[PDB]
């Protein structure tokens, strides 16, 4: 039976910071961010939050659907570690502002950066259950980093999941997973994060190897080089993905350094292009890598892509699917590259004021009325584009506006 | 194909407060809590949290399984609105202390009191997907109310979900759902809650009617009186369920008050017995109602039970399944009634000190070392029973102990 991603759209912020500017101002060496493969990060404005990010990611998917097809969306799963309430899912606001049916299951899913993949797998199982033939699911991974600093971005990726997978056809039952309790990173307080970078790295590699091994036990004769034309990873920053791929290749194939580096460039580097322009966007990062792989790699014949998802805490999953030339052409028409190039480029001064202004929309805020003209220049880049923004919070009720 | 609940276990706290004591001390009329059908609420100790609640609910399920069957659990979903971190699911700690396989998907699911049902439905779809024949799922709804006051309890219910549904066989595809964005209640701050009781009531009734209507459109010829031998509801407090059932009967059947009251006693009252001894335990309340219905109703021949789930914010679902005499006998052996009767009964003085002591384990706590002898009497009721408790938090890492 067939199942997968019918459509994929991305929102990479309205603004970004070139990390060279951060380095220079923060008295670090410029070869640092270069060595880690970080170029830019998306930055959220105070009149934006995970809801507005998610709706803007999803809006193009919904714009294209017939009314009948729009009404077939019967599940909305929001995947996030930047929640705004202890009980209320963001899915309720998303439903409201996209105009979806009231006959719709709505909830939010949490397991650090694994959340997106977990949501995708639940959606896949809805279609495969055949409980409601024709039903689609909308899965949106959305996260903002509202203050590690240099790698922490903002973005969202929306996936429409159905039995006509125009973009990514899932290899059904081809899944391995692995997790265990570990304090690599966590978010025990609002608008905050705690963790050990060295333990983060160890756990990511341990899961990368063991999740793949589980997949291997389930998919007989699979080969780490030959069965996958490209690889996409959860990408905290590019340097770390390069390390993990190097480790996999050394162990699984006894490959030599030069061979490993050529394989990295061919199979992995295409996925990192967009990741370097947004930074780590948590549960949405793997899906952005997929989108990047599709736009930047070669799809003149169908290709298989291996997917590795990881979330601190920890849990992980390795899985796969296929993209055709048709799929790649549809994906190219979304214009991700151009979207990312048109974002406003922040000066260091603007960026520090942005940080200072972010306290007003902290977790738990009861009332706030946003000033859209905080940065008039950023506003020029938004007005008229049909973007959702956060207008206000009144007695904890969030109100949003199309601008 | 077959699917449902293979096993069900409950944890209803180590202590409780008789609400008559609260009334009297709080200068209210005693007919108040009587009129609302509230008798007792479970109360959480400071050395207990949602993790310890969940593990204690799940421990008997796991104790009974062969090693092979234990290893077949490949998904753990924790359903809660009392989370302890913004990214780390409680499922990781639960996995650790029950000893489950590392080849296991782990995440937490949020949509106020709808969370449990959403988790159950995802588990059902895992089995029905047939992606991994033989796989089971463990779904645990767990919540504590750590300070409306009189109705707010603490408890957890654990469900093992598989293709051998010894306890509750699900009617596959018999589902209606309904939700929309509404500010009836929400939890915008830690260890806190905001909401309007009158808007809460309106939304619950609106969803009760529309979720059922959706089920009706999908299940031809179904009848609200005749097709369901019992009804279980999300139960904020019994009076409200009585109101909702009255409303459904009036509208769907033109039934008269005396007929309605007899039907309430026959089909609904059995589900409320255990609910009145624990209070509102959020996402776990419907599953406790199911357990109560099973133990207190008549299962000498198989019976169909209609299930209504609601979560503020809001979303809801109506669904159904069947319990056989065999299932009911297995459920009786769990001894829920006796478990609930053996809890320590708090005086009003002990209860106010408990509230005062709860600040030490608030959301965001980085370090704390618990004094188990806070109430020596409560401890007598726990020591030696194989209960998990929270021992400490050290740099946000929670440590638990079997006692």
UniProtKB/TrEMBL annotation, chains A, B:
SUPFAM superfamilies hit by this protein: Thiolase-like (SSF53901)
Residues annotated for (R)-4'-phosphopantetheine 2 binding in this entry: 32, 151, 200, 280
Transmembrane residue ranges: none
Pfam families (alphabetical): HMG_CoA_synt_C, HMG_CoA_synt_N
CDD domains cross-referenced by the UniProt entry: init_cond_enzymes
Positions of the Hydroxymethylglutaryl-coenzyme A synthase C-terminal domain: 263-357
Alphabetized GO MF terms: hydroxymethylglutaryl-CoA synthase activity
UniProt-listed Enzyme Commission number(s): 2.3.3.10
Binding site for (R)-4'-phosphopantetheine 1: 32, 151
Name of the featured protein: CurD
Organism annotation: Moorena producens 3L
């Amino acid at each position: 039976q067939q199942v997968g991603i019918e459509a994929l759209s991305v929102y990479g912020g309205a603004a970004q910071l070139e990390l060279r500017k951060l380095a220079q101002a923060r008295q670090l060496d410029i070869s640092r961010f270069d060595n880690l493969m970080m170029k830019e990060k998306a930055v959220s404005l105070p009149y934006e939050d995970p809801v507005s990010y998610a709706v803007n990611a999803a809006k193009p998917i919904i714009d294209r659907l017939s009314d009948a097809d729009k009404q077939r969306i019967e599940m909305v799963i929001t995947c996030s570690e930047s929640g705004i309430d202890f009980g209320k899912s963001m899915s309720t606001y998303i439903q409201e502002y996209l105009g979806l049916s009231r006959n719709c299951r709505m909830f939010e899913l949490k397991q650090a950066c694994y959340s997106g993949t977990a949501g995708l797998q639940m959606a896949i199982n809805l279609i495969l259950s055949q409980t409601f033939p024709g039903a689609k699911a909308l899965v949106i991974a959305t996260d903002i980093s509202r203050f590690a600093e240099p790698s922490s971005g903002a973005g969202a990726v929306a996936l429409l999941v159905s039995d006509t997978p125009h973009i990514f056809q899932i290899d059904v039952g081809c899944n391995g997973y692995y997790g265990y309790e570990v304090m690599d990173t966590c978010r025990p307080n609002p608008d905050s994060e705690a963790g050990d970078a060295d333990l983060s790295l160890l756990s990511y590699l341990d899961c990368c190897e063991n999740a793949y091994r589980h997949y291997q036990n389930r998919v007989e004769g699979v080969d780490y080089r030959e069965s996958f034309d490209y690889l996409s990873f959860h990408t905290p920053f590019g340097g770390m993905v390069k390390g993990a791929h190097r480790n996999m290749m050394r162990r699984l194939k006894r490959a030599k350094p030069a061979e490993i580096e050529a394989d990295f460039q061919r199979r992995v580097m295409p996925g990192l292009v967009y990741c370097q322009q947004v930074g780590n966007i948590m549960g949405a990062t793997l899906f952005l890598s997929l989108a990047s792989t599709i736009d930047n790699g070669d799809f003149s014949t169908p290709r298989r892509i291996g997917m590795f998802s990881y979330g601190s805490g920890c849990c992980s999953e390795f899985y796969s699917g296929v993209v055709t030339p048709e799929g790649a052409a549809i994906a190219a028409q979304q214009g991700i590259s151009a979207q990312l190039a048109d974002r406003y480029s922040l000066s260091m001064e603007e960026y520090e004021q942005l940080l200072y202004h972010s306290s007003a929309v902290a977790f738990g805020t009861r009332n706030v009325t946003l000033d859209y003209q905080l940065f008039p220049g950023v506003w020029k880049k938004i007005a008229g584009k049909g973007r959702l923004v956060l207008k206000a919070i009144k007695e904890f009720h969030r109100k949003y506006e199309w601008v």
